[PDB]
């Protein structure tokens, strides 16, 4: 049978890939980073508390200038805050209140929203009338939208629940490229610092490295035992970290093309909703369903601190560009900034 | 206030106006009845709309209230990854057809749309997000059931079924079977209703169920329970 022959070929190729991956493993990160001094205890205190949302907060993104911030809640509101003074710069009402996404343009002129309506809405902030209009409404996905990650003022990526990713040209309003290959829902996105590649992590417990300019998968990383909800690049763009539903973070390496480190503890059993990296790449911050966040020494896997100030699940987590502060947003409609 | 420039007090003023508008909107939206419409492939989720992809929203007003109904039938994605978005809806309206006790689905083999509806109802009822949300169960398509139970008995829907072959007893058996699978009877109960083709009994029943649900949520905000 030709189908049987193709299945045997696929199995043989998977075995060859596994053997090649094994043959290039001589040591481990835990066996190499064994003589460096531990970071110690990372103690952080809340310095701002941004209130005003009246429902669960589902996403949040920092501004490139590290002062302005955007948050999306399920009461049908996108709020743009000035973190230094806690003032409400903007408040945008949404056509559909089922929103779990936020994106801030690198230039700062646009914001992007998406949710259960399968539509990516692009809002223009700098108008000649003092308003915030809906610049675009990109449609074409057949499942809910979960991450945007603006590229330029005219290019946007999208990850949706129909097991596909897309690259859209905003001006024309149509899909430029489509990335396929996942066998389950996709809830993640993270672009490389140079914005030529990106990674997605889906619900089939696998992550994929896509090339933006060619629309084809390069590498696939496995190892998790449940759905993946978070993903982020290492600052130098040569490794990434994933968070899933089995109470475990995992650091994978692009060049060696295999897993590097596992971050887990015995008395943690909940899921992980967010993942972010410190400015130097030494601290890994992960928000859990225990209503709090944990800090892991990225090179030794030892827990270095706990941020517990929320009365419900921690759903969004981010770090400023210059690494001054970390913002966490939870389902009690409160954002907190820790320094 | 004594260390702010002339352009910062105006920013504070704008923020305060934004806050006041947000509070007014939140006050307006806190007195809205929210219903989540659930069912099966074809059970009556369309015809129910006659009374008056992604989310589908319907708005209407019965006496003085603002009822909103959310329909999720085209959402073919994984239900576990978004069902928590509806934790807090006033009621869940579950539609079940009574003429699906002898019809197979496209899978053929051994399927019965009554049993699949039973599994979906059980999964929805025992969800961790809906441990205190009232469920209004509609049993649609009763006129055809009559006809079917005259010639075809309730033979292939429950192998252990025993008793007379009549509309009333069979309907009571189906209703009791559906009222089962709810292992929270202490702090939850279903609002069963055999739909009658009059277009006004259904809305009265929904209004009564919503009124009782609001009464039992106004006993917990005012420290009486």
């Amino acid at each position, epitope marked *: 049978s030709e189908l049987d022959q193709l299945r045997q070929e696929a199995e043989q190729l998977k075995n060859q890939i596994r053997d090649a991956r094994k043959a290039c493993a001589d040591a481990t990160l835990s066996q190499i980073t064994n003589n460096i001094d531990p970071v110690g205890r990372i103690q952080m205190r809340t310095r701002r508390t941004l209130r005003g949302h009246l429902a669960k907060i589902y996403a949040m993104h920092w501004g490139t200038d590290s002062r*302005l911030l955007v948050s999306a809640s399920q009461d049908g509101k996108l709020i743009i805050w000035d973190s230094y003074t806690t003032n409400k*710069v903007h408040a945008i009402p949404l056509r559909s209140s089922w929103v779990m996404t936020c994106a801030y343009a690198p230039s700062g002129n646009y914001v992007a929203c998406g949710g259960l309506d399968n539509i990516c809405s692009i809002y223009n902030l700098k108008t000649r009338e003092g308003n915030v209009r809906v610049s675009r409404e990109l449609a074409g996905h057949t499942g809910y939208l979960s991450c945007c990650r603006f590229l330029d003022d005219n290019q946007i990526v999208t990850s949706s629940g129909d097991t596909t990713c897309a690259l859209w040209d905003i001006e024309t309003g149509q899909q430029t490229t489509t990335f396929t290959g996942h066998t389950g829902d996709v809830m993640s996105l993270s672009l490389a610092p140079d914005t030529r590649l990106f990674v997605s992590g889906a619900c089939d417990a696998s992550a994929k490295l896509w090339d933006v300019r060619e629309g084809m998968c390069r590498q696939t990383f496995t190892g998790h035992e449940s759905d993946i909800n978070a993903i982020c690049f290492f600052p130098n763009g040569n490794a990434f970290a994933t968070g899933s539903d089995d109470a475990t973070c995992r650091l994978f390496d692009l060049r060696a093309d295999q897993e590097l480190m596992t971050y887990s503890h015995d008395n943690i059993i909940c899921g992980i909703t967010s993942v972010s990296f410190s400015k130097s790449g030494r601290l890994l911050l992960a928000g859990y369903d225990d209503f709090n966040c944990n800090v892991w020494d990225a090179l030794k896997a030892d827990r270095a601190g706990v941020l517990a100030g929320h009365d419900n699940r921690v759903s969004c987590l981010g770090v400023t560009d210059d690494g001054m502060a970390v913002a966490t947003g939870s389902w009690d409609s409160f954002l907190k900034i820790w320094n | 206030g004594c260390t702010l*420039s*002339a*352009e*910062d007090k*105006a920013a504070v*003023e*704008r923020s305060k106006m934004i806050d006041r508008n947000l509070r007014e909107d939140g006050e307006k939206a806190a007195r809205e009845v929210k219903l989540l419409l659930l069912g099966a492939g074809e059970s009556g989720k369309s015809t129910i709309v006659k009374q008056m992809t992604g989310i589908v929203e319907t708005h209407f007003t019965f006496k003085d209230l603002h009822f909103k109904m959310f329909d999720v039938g085209a959402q073919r994605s994984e239900r576990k990854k978004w069902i928590h978005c509806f934790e807090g809806v006033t009621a869940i309206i579950f539609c079940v057809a009574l003429s699906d006790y002898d019809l197979v689905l496209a899978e053929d083999e051994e399927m019965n749309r009554m049993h699949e509806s039973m599994k979906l109802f059980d999964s929805i009822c025992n969800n961790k997000w809906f441990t205190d949300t009232s469920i209004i169960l509609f049993l649609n398509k009763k006129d055809l059931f009559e006809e079917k139970i005259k010639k075809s008995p309730l033979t292939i829907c429950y192998p252990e079924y025993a008793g007379s072959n009549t509309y009333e007893e069979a309907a009571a058996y189906i209703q009791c079977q559906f009222e089962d699978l709810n292992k929270r009877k202490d702090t939850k109960e279903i609002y069963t209703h055999f739909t009658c083709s009059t277009d006004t009994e259904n809305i009265r029943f929904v209004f009564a169920a919503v009124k009782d649900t609001i009464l039992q949520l106004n006993l917990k905000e005012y420290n009486l329970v």
Partner: single-chain antibody
Amino acid sequence: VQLVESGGGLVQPGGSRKLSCSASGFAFSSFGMHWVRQAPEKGLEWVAYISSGSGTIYYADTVKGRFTISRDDPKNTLFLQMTSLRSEDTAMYYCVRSIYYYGSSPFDFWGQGTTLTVSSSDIVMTQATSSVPVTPGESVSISCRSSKSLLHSNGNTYLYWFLQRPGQSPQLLIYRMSNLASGVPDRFSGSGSGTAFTLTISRLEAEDVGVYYCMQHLEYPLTFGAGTKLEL
């Protein structure tokens, strides 16, 4: 976007008058509004300000108790009611919009003018050079100077540069001493220190001839600077 003003005309010494701005093309309810008057052959002079939502109101020292500022958001109208007019109220009044938040550009759009003719401390900003002879294709420099220091503790230096062409409403060029208003060519540049500022026109043209004013936005009196006329 436009503001059209009605009223003006000839008045007797001692009386009443009313000026109105009708604004079309923008969200009038979100913009604070200023009335600014210019004498027949003198520089601009701030008159009155009303906030958004009418929460805050400010009047100049010269016109207080006899001038009133009012707003009508449903009808998109701004009123100024003047009573007991002296002979010093003969001027041309302009309607200005200003929106304040982090990163905004106040004073960006100046309406047209309406003329009133009656028939009969505060920061001081200095513009030393009253007139400057210039030729196209060269570089020019205009400098202002304030009695106090406009550098606040939050790092913002509040200084604005306006250009009034021969027979037109003033146009905003620089806001907060280093930023460029939208639609202004990149050859305009402004800088300076906490007390002495400057404006640089890299390559002059035939449309840059006019009068340049420096204004402060630290304390709400809003003093203006004298004129520095550029001529061919």
